Amino acid sequence: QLTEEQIAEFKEAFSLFDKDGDGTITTKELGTVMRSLGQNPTEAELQDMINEVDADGNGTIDFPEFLTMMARKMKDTDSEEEIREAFRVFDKDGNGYISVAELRHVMTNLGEKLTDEEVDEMIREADIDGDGQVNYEEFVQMMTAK
Amino acid sequence: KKAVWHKLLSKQRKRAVVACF
Ligand SMILES: [Ca+2]
Ligand SMILES: [Ca+2]
Ligand SMILES: [Ca+2]
Ligand SMILES: [Ca+2]
Secondary structure (H helix, E strand, C coil): CCCHHHHHHHHHHHHHHCCCCCCEECHHHHHHHHHHCCCCCCHHHHHHHHHHHCCCCCCCEEHHHHHHHHHHHCCCCCHHHHHHHHHHHHCCCCCCCECHHHHHHHHHHCCCCCCHHHHHHHHHHHCCCCCCCECHHHHHHHHCCC | CHHHHHHHHHHHHHHHHHCCC
């Protein structure tokens, strides 16, 4: 069903939600993650999401339940397809380059406070060829390390 | 800062996982 590489990647994802390491994701933990992404879920939304994934109706998500979800929805992700997907999302106009203005929009969309000086520094540090934007090879070099 | 690049990748990954619920 699921390989070992992907079960390890999914456990690492799980750990980002299970902040107290108790082996369950609560509506509180899901809500914390969502608000860290700039989203504003209601408690009713959070409950609906937990209910969709929660196989034994105990009102929390254990790792087996989370794994069943990832296997239904993400059974083809690696560190590589995720970087490729992130680049496609960030490159709003689809020209194969991330601009200063595109990175500002991504930051807002993901609830990351910004300044112009921070965005400039980010583009300059990633921009290996000096053309003033970040192409995919540049992105991959910057994103390969966690 | 590289940390902020990495944090954005992780936020995008978390958004994709949240969208699976
Ligand atoms: Ca927990
Ligand atoms: Ca459960
Ligand atoms: Ca672009
Ligand atoms: Ca460049």
